[PDB]
Design a protein around this motif. Structure first.
Motif, short mmCIF file in Angstrom:
data_model
loop_
_atom_site.label_atom_id
_atom_site.label_comp_id
_atom_site.label_asym_id
_atom_site.label_seq_id
_atom_site.Cartn_x
_atom_site.Cartn_y
_atom_site.Cartn_z
N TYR A 313 39.75 31.48 6.55
CA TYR A 313 40.58 30.62 7.38
C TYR A 313 39.82 30.13 8.61
O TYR A 313 39.91 28.95 8.97
CB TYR A 313 41.85 31.38 7.79
CG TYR A 313 42.93 30.58 8.51
CD1 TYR A 313 43.41 29.39 7.99
CD2 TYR A 313 43.50 31.05 9.68
CE1 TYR A 313 44.40 28.68 8.62
CE2 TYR A 313 44.50 30.35 10.33
CZ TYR A 313 44.95 29.17 9.79
OH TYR A 313 45.95 28.47 10.43
N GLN A 314 39.06 31.02 9.25
CA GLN A 314 38.29 30.63 10.42
C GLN A 314 37.14 29.69 10.08
O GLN A 314 36.56 29.08 10.99
CB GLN A 314 37.72 31.86 11.13
CG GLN A 314 38.76 32.85 11.62
CD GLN A 314 38.12 34.08 12.26
OE1 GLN A 314 37.46 34.87 11.59
NE2 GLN A 314 38.31 34.22 13.57
N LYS A 315 36.77 29.57 8.81
CA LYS A 315 35.73 28.64 8.39
C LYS A 315 36.30 27.37 7.78
O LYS A 315 35.57 26.59 7.16
CB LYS A 315 34.79 29.33 7.40
CG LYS A 315 33.89 30.38 8.04
CD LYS A 315 33.32 31.35 7.00
CE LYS A 315 32.66 32.54 7.67
NZ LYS A 315 32.65 33.75 6.79
N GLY A 316 37.60 27.13 7.95
CA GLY A 316 38.20 25.95 7.37
C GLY A 316 38.38 25.98 5.87
O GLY A 316 38.65 24.94 5.28
N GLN A 317 38.23 27.14 5.24
CA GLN A 317 38.50 27.25 3.82
C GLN A 317 39.99 27.43 3.57
O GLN A 317 40.72 27.96 4.41
CB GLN A 317 37.74 28.42 3.21
CG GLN A 317 36.23 28.36 3.37
CD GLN A 317 35.52 29.42 2.56
OE1 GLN A 317 36.04 29.91 1.56
NE2 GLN A 317 34.31 29.78 2.99
N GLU A 318 40.43 26.99 2.40
CA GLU A 318 41.79 27.25 1.96
C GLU A 318 41.95 28.70 1.52
O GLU A 318 41.10 29.23 0.80
CB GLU A 318 42.15 26.30 0.81
CG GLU A 318 43.57 26.46 0.33
CD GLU A 318 43.87 25.55 -0.83
OE1 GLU A 318 43.12 25.62 -1.84
OE2 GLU A 318 44.84 24.77 -0.71
N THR A 319 43.04 29.33 1.94
CA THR A 319 43.32 30.72 1.58
C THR A 319 44.56 30.81 0.69
O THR A 319 45.38 29.89 0.65
CB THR A 319 43.52 31.58 2.83
OG1 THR A 319 44.68 31.14 3.53
CG2 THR A 319 42.30 31.48 3.74
N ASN A 387 48.41 27.89 -2.35
CA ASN A 387 47.74 28.46 -1.18
C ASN A 387 48.76 29.18 -0.30
O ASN A 387 49.97 29.20 -0.58
CB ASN A 387 46.96 27.39 -0.41
CG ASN A 387 47.84 26.35 0.26
OD1 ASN A 387 48.92 26.65 0.78
ND2 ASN A 387 47.37 25.11 0.27
#
Ligand SMILES: NC(=O)C1=CN([C@@H]2O[C@H](COP(=O)(O)OP(=O)(O)OC[C@H]3O[C@@H](n4cnc5c(N)ncnc54)[C@H](OP(=O)(O)O)[C@@H]3O)[C@@H](O)[C@H]2O)C=CC1
Ligand SMILES: NC(=O)C1=CN([C@@H]2O[C@H](COP(=O)(O)OP(=O)(O)OC[C@H]3O[C@@H](n4cnc5c(N)ncnc54)[C@H](OP(=O)(O)O)[C@@H]3O)[C@@H](O)[C@H]2O)C=CC1
Ligand SMILES: Cc1cn(C(=O)c2c(-c3c(Cl)cc(Cl)cc3Cl)noc2C(C)(C)F)c2cccc(/C=C/C(=O)O)c12
Ligand SMILES: Cc1cn(C(=O)c2c(-c3c(Cl)cc(Cl)cc3Cl)noc2C(C)(C)F)c2cccc(/C=C/C(=O)O)c12
Lengths: 406, 408
Positions: A313-319, A387
């Motif tokens: 999440y902190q790297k802009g990835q979808e979780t 997501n």
């Protein structure tokens, strides 16, 4: 208008679970329930700022108001101290709470039609109460004698047992203890859980090796059963039996489920958490701490804060973090509040949110971990799952429809 | 000659059903093709109780000398056994006797068939588990605390110049239980060496799992001795085979293992445990090898017991279907190791070929009732789904003769 929910102690946590927690409150709880909320922030920064006092205040609150729902928290290690520039390596919030409250942690996997379980033959749920920490270990520098002694408070004869003669070289040694009262509370919580849920109860030990240590667990469980619970059990056509751990594992895997499993293992054995995590079902593992009085309860997800998903999440990835375990912390606490306060309407809500969670997943809408559990991670495509936010939105939409009927 | 000369092998005969299979394996699969300097020791109950359990110590000493031992399953006496045979004494377990004379570490390994599902479906390579069977719970001192009082644990050096008293607990109200546990540095070192040997032998990464977050000193000692032994004696050889060694917290290792493809050695500090194979599938596919820290001496045996249930049916005369795989692999693993010590290329080929034929025979549909139940579920096993004990030995022999033909 909304439901009067009464007195509930809430503990806010850390990282990915902290986000899900607020999503659960804003989308699934607060639209439908007003709570006299005793809220305490156990985020790692607020613990540091209050020198962990908030943590202890929360435990005292649970004991006063009988119902706590806790969000997963960061237990600091050397790296977290560096990460958050902490004043000191604060002890675990869970250790601190359980030390103050006492009771037994009960773990339970949530079942959905379309999610296969660890063992295909299991049909009815299984609830695991494992007693596991507080030991003293040291290094044996060289040859020498290690002894464990008992000195009665009343001045009678001191007793000495030989642990080992180190004739050559050194090594390590440790001492461990347990109080009868703790075994008794363990016993009472387990029998009351069996009668509560209506399942039989098994206790597993290794009393062939630790004939005296584990034998105490067996004897205490058996006295308390025979004198204080056998009749109620037989009334509900259930039963209690002790089992060697060797046999219990075999019995469980051939069982159809539907039992309580009071378990006494050493401090370094495999725990049901780790296996669920390996199987990919930890996002569905609930936990509840049940004090021996039958009144006080602290419900939580069995998993941690899901740091790895938080970093994504902190790297802009979808979780795609599973919120079910955290949702069942709320439904189990609220369901217990309803039992204490005789709140028919709050009981209805607790069950209704549990059914919507299960129905949603069974209808095909699930986070990535549940899709991998069906198909195996390698074959999981994006269209197989939702997501973190898509899934919370879906639960929210189905919960509104559920409750809109009555 | 047309028989391979295998060299010195110490053999330990056993009890009940495995004893029956033991002779079948020797005459049907071993003796026709391999000529051994066999040093045989009967470890059945009758001869153990007869020699005051001295044959067990003598067999172990022969293993220390010749470096290779294959052992049939034996009965560990208990109250019921003492009655059955009217023993002179409830003898200690032969395995513990041998494992205490030789030292070293036991490693368990399941044998894989494409048609026999495994515990975790993602597993594709083998997994070899070795747990520390010295000290700890197996050698623990526990007692009952009758009432209020102080339980302490003290260390006194041999020179007696010092005495360190640790407080285990002060029982303020009521009694309870306490215990003391130990582990010698030697045993941990032997545990590290035996596990680094095993990883090099199989060419797979090694993981030590401990609980050193709770037992910072007790379990941290394992982690430290492994790492320094690894660094000072094995890291170059591990990198040579593009493998590695890493410590893991037991919490993480369990989940990593379940999420991996397999193909690793798992050094574990928890025995007091791999008997989920009983409830899941069959122990007939579970092998074990005692590996000494010298890396030269081993003892191979089936991880399962004597299967007394099948021996009761055998003595009557009604058919049985007992799995010989774990017993066969006790021979093949010991012979593979003899082949390694002697640079005996032909014996090595024989060992591997007998393992392949066993696996291929099952994968091709011929199997004992335990594996047929693993596939179809026990209530669904028809008599035609499996081969009885002697039929299956016949099948392996037929396929074994064919396998050896096509290579030499
Ligand atoms: N009760 C509590 O407050 C507890 C707190 N913790 C704390 O949590 C932090 C993180 O520890 P960690 O070791 O990661 O423990 P977690 O249980 O948070 O481990 C998370 C991992 O397990 C899987 N997982 C767990 N929960 C979920 C979920 N809801 N949805 C999907 N997958 C899930 C994921 O696997 P994958 O990576 O394959 O996606 C993820 O990487 C630590 O600081 C620890 O102290 C730990 C345990 C209990
Ligand atoms: N290393 C050793 O020498 C060991 C020896 N023993 C000894 O073995 C004896 C029996 O002990 P027990 O608890 O029954 O352990 P066993 O492993 O011998 O028996 C367990 C059961 O699992 C099934 N099973 C196990 N192995 C096989 C096989 N090869 N083929 C088919 N089915 C198999 C059988 O049950 P089912 O009928 O359901 O198929 C068997 O009765 C005791 O005297 C014990 O001390 C025990 C363990 C280790
Ligand atoms: C029921 C259960 C037991 N677990 C254990 O860890 C086991 C087992 C065991 C069994 Cl019974 C079967 C298998 Cl395949 C493997 C094991 Cl290790 N043997 O002992 C234990 C402990 C140490 C906890 F007492 C679980 C772990 C994770 C999820 C679960 C999930 C339960 C469910 O889906 O309803 C369970
Ligand atoms: C690999 C392996 C581990 N076993 C354990 O007992 C476990 C486990 C565990 C795992 Cl990894 C998965 C599940 Cl589902 C349950 C458990 Cl308990 N966690 O730690 C342990 C040890 C022994 C280290 F303490 C086995 C037991 C039987 C057969 C097997 C393997 C069978 C096969 O390859 O075909 C293995």
């Amino acid at each position: 208008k909304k439901i009067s929910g009464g007195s509930v102690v809430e503990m806010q946590g850390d990282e990915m679970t902290r986000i899900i927690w607020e999503l659960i409150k804003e989308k699934l709880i607060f639209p439908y329930v007003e709570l006299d909320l005793h809220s305490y922030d156990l985020g790692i920064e607020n613990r540091d700022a209050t020198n962990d006092q908030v943590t202890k205040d929360a435990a005292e609150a649970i004991k006063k108001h009988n119902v706590g729902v806790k969000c997963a928290t960061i237990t600091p290690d050397e790296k977290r101290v560096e990460e958050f520039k902490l004043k000191q390596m604060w002890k675990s919030p869970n250790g601190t709470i359980r030390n103050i409250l006492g009771g037994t942690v009960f773990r339970e996997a949530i079942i959905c039609k379309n999610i296969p379980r660890l063992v295909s033959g299991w049909v009815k749920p299984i609830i695991i109460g494992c007693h596991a920490y507080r030991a003293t270990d040291f290094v044996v520098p060289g040859p020498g004698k290690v002894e464990i002694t008992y000195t009665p408070s009343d001045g009678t004869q001191k007793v000495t047992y030989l642990v080992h003669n180190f004739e050559e070289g050194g090594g390590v040694a440790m001492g461990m203890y347990n109080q009868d009262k703790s075994i008794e509370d363990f016993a009472h919580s387990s029998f009351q859980m069996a009668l509560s849920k209506g399942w039989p109860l098994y206790l597993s030990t290794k009393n062939t090796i630790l004939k005296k240590y584990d034998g105490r667990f067996k004897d205490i469980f058996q006295e308390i059963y025979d004198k204080q619970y056998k009749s109620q059990f037989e009334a509900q056509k259930i039963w209690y039996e002790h089992r060697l751990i060797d046999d219990m594992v075999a019995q469980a895997m051939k069982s159809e489920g539907g039992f309580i499993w009071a378990c006494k293992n050493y401090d370094g054995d495999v725990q049901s958490d780790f296996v669920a995590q390996g199987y990919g079902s930890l996002g569905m593992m609930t936990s509840v701490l049940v004090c021996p009085d039958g009144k006080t309860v602290e419900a939580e997800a069995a998993h941690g804060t899901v740091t790895r998903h938080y970093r994504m999440y902190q790297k802009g990835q979808e979780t795609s973090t599973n919120p079910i375990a955290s949702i069942f912390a709320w439904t189990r606490g609220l369901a217990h509040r309803a039992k204490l306060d005789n709140n028919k309407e709050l009981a209805f809500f607790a069950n209704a949110l549990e059914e919507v969670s299960i129905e949603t997943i069974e209808a095909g809408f699930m986070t990535k971990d549940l899709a991998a559990c069906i198909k195996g991670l390698p074959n999981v495509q994006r269209s197989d799952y939702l997501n973190t936010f898509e899934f919370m939105d879906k639960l929210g939409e189905n919960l509104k429809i559920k409750l809109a009927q009555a």
